[PDB]
C-alpha cells in the first residue's frame, strides 16, 4: 500500500470532515486527508472520481492514491500545496492585477473542466462540485489555483441522460449555499441546477479574491462572504434570512469601479448572484471573459 510507506509529519487542517496532513512518501511531500468514518461516502465519491473517471487537470487537485482498512482508516493521498488554501493565502497576501486574474482564471478553468462533458475513451461526464469555497481551493507554487474536495460531486452523461447524484447525507457549506438551496426550491432532478449552485459559490469566491487586489493604493482586509450579517459557523436559518428573505448580496466597494479589472470582476460577480438560477453565467462564459481582460 502507499499508506504503509507514508510518514505523517504535521497536521495542516483539522475539522468535522477529518484531518489533512503533510506527509512524506518516497522522498516527496504528499497530502493525506484522513476521513472520519462518519464521512466515508465522501471518501468513496472522491476515490471513484479520481480512480474511475480519471479526473485530471492542472486546476484540479492531483490524485496520487486512496487507501482504506477495516476500527476504520480512510485515506486520500494527493499532491501537497505548501501555500495552503486560497482562504489561508488571502489572509496574509494582497494581490496585483496579474496575480488576481491568474487566480480567478485558474478557478474558472478548473470549474469549466468539471462542468463540460468530454466524449471518447479518454473523456469524462459533466461534473458539478457542490461545495465550492475558498477553503476547498489550493494555491499552487506557480500562482494558479486548483479545486479540491469532490466528496459531494454529481455527474451527468448525455448518452444515457443519467443524473448520478450518489448517496451522501453531507450537505454543502452553509455560508456558500445558493438561494434555491436555502429555500428548498432547487430542482434536484435537473443536472443544470447543480452547475448553477457552483456558479453562485464561484461568485462569492470572486468577491473574496477581488477584495485583496490593490488598486490606487487601497485594498480591503480579508473577510468571508456575508461577514457583516451572519455569525461564524452560521445556521441554515441565518443564511436563508440574509440571502432569500432580505435578498442581500456581498457589498461591492465603490473604489472598484475606478479600476478596469475590479470593474469587470464586479460585473461577473453580480451575474453569478441572480436569484433566478437560469440567469446566471456559465463557467465557460466566465472563463472567456477573464481570458479577454
Ligand atoms: C486532500 C488534500 C488537500 C490538501 C492538499 N494540499 N493541502 C495543503 C494544506 C495546507 C493548508 C494550510 C497551510 N499553511 C497554513 C499556515 N500558513 C502557511 C500555509 C499549508 C498547507 C491543506 N490541505 C491540502 C485538501 C484540501 C482541501 C480539501 N480537500 C483536500 C484533500
Ligand atoms: Ca490497504
Ligand atoms: Ca476577502
Numbering used by the authors: 203 to 272, 276 to 498
Which sentences from the paper describe this structure?
Here we determined the crystal structure of ALK2 in complex with LDN-212854 revealing subtle differences in its binding compared to LDN-193189. Four protein-inhibitor complexes were observed in the asymmetric unit with no significant structural differences. The structure of the ALK2 kinase domain in complex with LDN-212854 was observed to adopt an inactive conformation similar to the more complete structure of the ALK2 GS and kinase domains bound to FKBP12. In this shared inhibitory conformation there is close packing of the kinase N and C-lobes creating strong interactions for the inhibitor bound in the central ATP-binding pocket. However, at the solvent-exposed entrance of the active site the binding of ATP and substrate would be sterically occluded by the inward folding of the activation segment. Here, a single hydrogen bond is observed between the N-1 nitrogen of the pyrazolo[1,5-a]pyrimidine moiety and the backbone nitrogen of His286. Most importantly, the central pyrazolo[1,5-a]pyrimidine moiety orients the 5-quinoline group to the back pocket where it packs below Val222. In the inactive ALK2 conformation the catalytically important salt bridge between Lys235 (β3 strand) and Glu248 (αC) is broken and these side chains are free for interaction with inhibitors. The nitrogen of the 5-quinoline of LDN-212854 appears optimally positioned to form a water-mediated hydrogen bond that bifurcates to contact both Lys235 and Glu248. Thus, the 5-quinoline of LDN-212854 appears particularly favourable for establishing a larger network of water-mediated hydrogen bonding in ALK2.
